[PDB]
Structure 1
């Protein structure tokens, strides 16, 4: 008799380590016999028995003849797909959940919820799937590419919370939260505070009372908007992270944005989804983040950590925890997720490593995983191993 899931205390440990590389295009040469799917925006969500590796496919494999368009964001062909984590996401291994050029998913202890956005840019559509069944939708409210998290949503006691946003990518994008229960949207939550532009939130439980999200401002700042969501009152507030360690790409030099914590500063235009995940201890909360090694390119990926504090108020630099992806390798999207051990939760960060050779060739990604395990210092970086000319 399956019960509702709740966030548990995190497992012991004080450092991340390289766990797993999922690099489908290691097998996509013309000399070869495999059919890895062309994908971007991967993320991982785990239930009580299984981990699922999600992505947005372009509905084409490599090698193949439909490369043209695979460097685009949205079209009528993109689908949310998944494999069990640890499987190579090929044509045959994958399962196609729904049409979607923006997605999310989560397990509530009883059943998977799948979330997909599709439709025309000026009138997109959020779709909710619970198990096999399509159960609810939510309409565009600003008529400017309604879109969601591109990472796991979060469930507590059967209630799943999901960030959505709608609005110009170079102007205002006031985000909303949806409270979804058993596939049906039972409440809209309208955040207060600094709501100018929030998107692609990476969200997790700081506790049984609070969800926290580190998001992307693609318009005004290289500081990440940081959401605190009270799950007991269904209220949310947004403020920019204050840390000198700006987590967006592009970004100016750390600590160079002058004025109070709310100051936007320079190099704010553009952005990237950033990894964020909680380490819940008896009396401390650990906050782990990732950002690219380069200040302007999607190259490299570093891990940072800060225990305790108010992310809205602490200007202190984050503690650099190690290089996950070298500056010589691609470092694009990253995301947090949690594996369920028998009695506690294991916090992890996944990294999207995009193979980018321009619009004249195929365009896809690998996925690297780092997880909290043991003590000491982070020891090894991840390479993709792929030569795009093969």
Structure 2
């Protein structure tokens, strides 16, 4: 039976710790993949961590140069949530340096992009079998979510981008059924930039919060039907969501140009005209993490907010973050539960090592008591090498 995706998001008060894989700490001795761009996605039965390996293990010479984003050796793999990603516990999914994945209630859909920068191809698989292919249409690093796609009523949804990372690019939404593209639409979004979208279902409608790598310190959003009829904007809150960014100030419901170049993958959950914003604590680097409840932040431009929950201290490295959801058919609830993960990047460029890898933590939205703290990576660098 297919995930309905017809229920609204659960009301929540805060975020309870869900997982921590301690991957880098464990990899000091154990056989743990060098990875980055991890994400969590759930079915009607289980929750899995997906990740892009570098086809190499921590503390081994083949970890050399793994700051590098794209290679033929990068693979999408998955393991049960909270476990350190190892060749002994991980399922192979796809050859990929950019990925997405989601379960429709029947099978896993995985999307894996590999190939050359000027002609990359997204390979779609449904239950591990190739069901479709999407080829680069702008010949400039075809690239997708690095988090879970969204499913409603037997149809699953993703966003891909193609073109410059430093200017106007091309943005497409894709609708797939049983791993096959049945509809796509190019966004008519001049002056906007979409990348690395974190997309979730809410009462039959999909909302994505993305990365403006071009000229935005706030995050752009797209929301759409099951017919791909869409609306676009930027989160108006002056509690700026990207990294880097300016100090909190007067928002825009377009791109905030100070410190708008570059970015980091992130997410936010829309609650009416309010927003839950996950962001780094640093304005400059991928350091720290916090959840902020801003009850008029989706549409209003002020920097005032109601509630900050600490997740990672400023003195500790963070990285990418993304939404994931737990559906009624898994939880038994009457609503869709919002959750999030944070990637905890260690190594290059910030630290003197030959390698780059990430750990993960995750949290679920809860309508009971919670607490702020710091759950950092905890590895001691550098390694034996």
Shared fold per TM-score greater than 0.5? yes
Residues 158 and 195 of structure 1, relative CA distance in 2, 3 Å threshold: farther
In the TM superposition, residue 9 of structure 1 has moved relative to its aligned partner by 3.9
Cα shift at 1:383: 1.8
Counterpart in the other structure of 1:329: 316
By how many angstroms is 1:319 displaced?
A: 3.8
Does the Cα contact within 8 Å between 1:37 and 1:59 map onto a contact in 2?
Answer: yes
Superimposed CA distance per residue, residues 336-376 of structure 1 (whole angstroms, 9 cap, x where no aligned partner): 11123123432111000011244742210110111112434
**Gap runs ≥5 in structure 2:** none
Q: Which stretch has the larger CA shift, 61-70 or 317-326?
A: 317-326
* Alignment pair present for 1:299 and 2:287: yes
Cα 1:85/1:7, change in 2 over 3 Å: farther
Mean Cα deviation higher: 87-96 or 153-162 = 87-96
Q: Work out whether residues 5 and 203 of structure 2, in 8 Å CA contact, stay in contact via their aligned partners in 1.
A: no
Asked if 1:316 corresponds to 2:323, the answer is no
Question: Is residue 121–residue 146 contact of structure 1 (8 Å, CA) maintained in 2?
Answer: yes
Structure 1: state its 5+ residue gaps. none
1:246 counterpart residue number: 240
Question: How do 1:372-387 residues align onto structure 2 when only pairs under 5 Å count?
Answer: 372-387=365-380
Measured in 2, the distance between the counterparts of 1:27 and 1:262 equals 43
The residue number in structure 2 matching 1:224 is 219
Aligned CA RMSD, in angstroms, stands at 2.0
Deviation at 1:246, TM superposition (A): 1.1
Count of residue correspondences = 376
SS of 2:196's partner is strand
**What does residue range 260-275 of structure 1 map to in structure 2 within 5 Å?**
261-262=253-254, 264-275=256-267
C-alpha separation in 1, matches of 2:90 and 2:346: 20
Equivalent residue runs for 1:1-390 within 5 Å: 2-11=1-10, 13-29=12-28, 32=29, 34-194=30-190, 196-208=192-204, 210-231=205-226, 233-256=227-250, 261-262=253-254, 264-277=256-269, 287-307=275-295, 311=298, 313-317=299-303, 318-339=305-326, 340-343=330-333, 344-358=335-349, 360-390=353-383
Render the CA deviation track for 1:207-244: whole Å, top value 9, x for unaligned: 22x2111111101111211112122x421232122111
| 1:121 partner SS | coil
Secondary structure in structure 2 of the residue aligned to 1:26 = helix
| TM norm structure 1 | 0.91
SS in 2 for 1:141: coil
